Amino acid sequence: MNCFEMLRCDEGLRLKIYKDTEGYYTIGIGHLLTKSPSLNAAKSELDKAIGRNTNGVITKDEAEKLFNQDVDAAVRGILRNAKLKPVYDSLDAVRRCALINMVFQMGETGVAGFTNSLRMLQQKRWDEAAVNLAKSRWYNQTPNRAKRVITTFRTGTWDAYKNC
């Protein structure tokens, strides 16, 4: 398992615009398009991303490249970040994905506000970090996924993704 697989597991794949967990427009492997209520807004955004008139539908291939970019943006974001870079650096291979996952799903900023957890993660007080993370809006809005991520942080294994 890699961070890519893990993500692919959590977000899945769709080749047609769709709505996400918070009703937003996305496509492919969870690539967000717009928070606007407009679907024209979404196709437009997507067309721009893709380099063509998609009419709302794309190819496996295009989705994958967006994914790659998307992943890249997360890590880049973790790295430019004064608050997560340190955390990241101290993570082992597996937990490192967990953090990436978190950042992919909500953004650097959002993730950067996990102040105490971040600390604890840095210190390697897993069980503690875990508890703390559960008490978040994040955890409230997406329980199933949170558990997985958090569990990863907790164990540092890919047991929660066993069935992916």
Curated annotation (Swiss-Prot):
Keywords: Antimicrobial, Bacteriolytic enzyme, Cytolysis, Glycosidase, Host cell lysis by virus, Host cytoplasm, Hydrolase, Viral release from host cell. Pfam families: Phage_lysozyme (PF00959). The gene is E. Its main location: host cell. One of its GO terms (molecular function) is lysozyme activity. This is Endolysin. It catalyses: Hydrolysis of (1->4)-beta-linkages between N-acetylmuramic acid and N-acetyl-D-glucosamine residues in a peptidoglycan and between N-acetyl-D-glucosamine residues in chitodextrins. SUPFAM superfamilies: Lysozyme-like. GO terms for biological process: cell wall macromolecule catabolic process; defense response to bacterium; peptidoglycan catabolic process; viral release from host cell by cytolysis. Endolysin with lysozyme activity that degrades host peptidoglycans and participates with the holin and spanin proteins in the sequential events which lead to the programmed host cell lysis releasing the mature viral particles. Once the holin has permeabilized the host cell membrane, the endolysin can reach the periplasm and break down the peptidoglycan layer. Induction: Expressed late in the viral replication. HAMAP family: ENDOLYSIN_T4. The keyword ATP-binding does not apply. Changing G30A: Almost complete loss of enzymatic activity. It comes from Enterobacteria phage T4. Belongs to the glycosyl hydrolase 24 family. Its EC number is 3.2.1.17. GO terms for cellular component: host cell cytoplasm. Changing E11 to A/F/H/M/N: Complete loss of enzymatic activity. The active site is at E11, D20. Optimum pH is 7.3.
